[PDB]
């Protein structure tokens, strides 16, 4: 198997300089022409640049013409992108890619083209005004109307956090049937929120133990409030 790994993106201040990398595994990296492509959330693919298999030939984009720097080193089996001058639009996961063909041609036009079938894991750049603020997590109790052999949705709620990502697995991964993590919601306050519950029969009322798991890693905050349907006490 052949696979690519990218890491290094995250919380970065505007106008500064940064360094990114592409780990490679499975194939002869020096025998291929590398890629640099970014994918903005809420947007589509935004190609950045390209590089020949040996580094002699380089191809770039018009929008940030000269604004970044692109490089590779054969011995360390790694690919690099010395990007600079971050702006608002460039918030995008960066995907390192392998070339489907090296320099194929139609018959008259011969250039190092770009074809991707295998991609990388993904590294995302975070340039924003809102800082890495910690969240406040709410528990979602099931309403009393779901009883007598029905389904009572229940879990926990996370709102007003930043930045991405966060992962929710029921019972710390011990439960997987019914986990439905709603996509994160970027609010007008520059913060985040979503939902995540599991579907279980109401026969587990008062007997099953709920522990909602929140993994908001780039800020590394976790909340374990004892989860239950709230009692009917005035």
């Amino acid at each position: 198997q052949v696979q690519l790994v990218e890491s290094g993106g995250g919380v970065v201040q505007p106008g500064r300089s940064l360094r990114l990398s592409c780990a490679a595994s499975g194939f002869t990296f020096r025998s291929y022409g590398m890629h640099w492509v970014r994918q903005a959330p809420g947007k589509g693919l935004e190609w950045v640049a390209f590089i020949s298999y040996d580094g002699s030939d380089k191809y770039y984009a018009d929008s940030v013409k000269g604004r970044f720097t692109i490089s590779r080193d054969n011995s360390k089996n790694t690919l690099y992108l010395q990007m600079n001058s971050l702006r608002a639009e460039d918030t995008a996961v960066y995907y390192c890619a392998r070339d489907l063909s090296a320099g194929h041609c139609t018959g008259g036009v011969c250039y190092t083209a770009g074809g991707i079938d295998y991609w990388g894991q993904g590294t995302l750049v975070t340039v924003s005004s809102a800082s890495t603020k910690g969240p406040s997590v709410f528990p979602l109790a099931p309403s009393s109307k779901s009883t007598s052999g029905g389904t009572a949705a229940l879990g926990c709620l996370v709102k007003d956090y930043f930045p991405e990502p966060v992962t929710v697995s029921w019972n710390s991964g011990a439960l997987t049937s019914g986990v439905h993590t709603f996509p994160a919601v970027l609010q007008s306050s520059g913060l985040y929120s979503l939902s995540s519950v599991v579907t279980v029969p109401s026969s587990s009322l008062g007997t099953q133990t709920y522990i909602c798991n929140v993994n908001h890693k780039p800020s590394n905050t976790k909340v374990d409030k004892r989860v239950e349907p709230k009692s009917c006490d005035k």
Binding site: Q39, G42, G44, L45, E46, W47, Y59, Y60, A61, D62, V93, Y95, L100, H104, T106, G107, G108, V109, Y111, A113, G114, G115, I116, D117, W119, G122, D160, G178, H180, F182, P183, V185, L186, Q187, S188, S189, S193, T199
Partner: protein, 216 residues
């Protein structure tokens, strides 16, 4: 440099075939490099077709690309669609200076009945209000098809600042759901008599109301 145009949303039942007009309005795109990628929302795009009619590994054989030689455009043919095929389709290529991407698509598979949208709001709490910060919460769930539009209004006046409609999400009951938030100062919360969360569901408007009697 150049630009491709894609219909941002096309709906078709899985039994029939869909087509995309990959129209790069400038120059020509004959005898050059061809690409095609498909993206499941929230995930990385997956390649569809490269150089006319070449398909990757693991993809269903149903997909098939094409190019309109006379009209200087391309097209993709997928015979016998599936509900699993609901995703975003993109049109990439390379003219010999740079790479261009199209407008995007929202292909809808009309294999399931539509759902009546029922909405319920979530008012802010009293404890957080002490910091002059409160966000208006709107929940939309169980709507089909997923192509939805949400608008915010204040005293019948449309609102644009702070308005954000999130991506409709695939649900357990095969329906769709989303949400929209609006963080406004309490002065805006107090001054306006009422607001509205106007949501358009394929020509059907679904809306619910919130009141200040629960804010104090």
């Amino acid at each position: 440099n150049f630009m491709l145009t894609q219909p941002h949303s096309v709906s078709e039942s899985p039994g029939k075939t869909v087509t995309i007009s990959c129209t790069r309005n400038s120059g020509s795109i004959a005898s050059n490099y061809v690409q095609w990628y498909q993206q499941r929302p929230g995930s990385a795009p997956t390649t569809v077709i490269y150089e006319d009619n070449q398909r990757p590994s693991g993809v269903p054989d149903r997909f098939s690309g094409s190019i309109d030689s006379s009209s200087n455009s391309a097209s993709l043919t997928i015979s016998g669609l599936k509900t699993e095929d609901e995703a975003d389709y993109y049109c990439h290529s390379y003219d010999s200076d740079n790479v261009v991407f199209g407008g995007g698509t929202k292909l809808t598979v009309l294999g399931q009945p539509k759902a009546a949208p029922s909405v319920t709001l979530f008012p802010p709490s009293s404890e957080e209000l002490q910091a002059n910060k409160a966000t208006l919460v709107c929940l939309i769930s169980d709507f089909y098809p997923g192509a939805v539009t949400v608008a915010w209004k204040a005293d019948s006046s449309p609102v644009k600042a702070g308005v954000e409609t999130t991506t409709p999400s695939k649900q357990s009951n095969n329906k769709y759901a989303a949400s929209s938030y609006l963080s406004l100062t309490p002065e805006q919360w107090k001054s306006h008599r009422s607001y509205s969360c106007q949501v358009t569901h394929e020509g059907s408007t679904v809306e619910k109301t919130v009141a200040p009697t629960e804010c104090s």
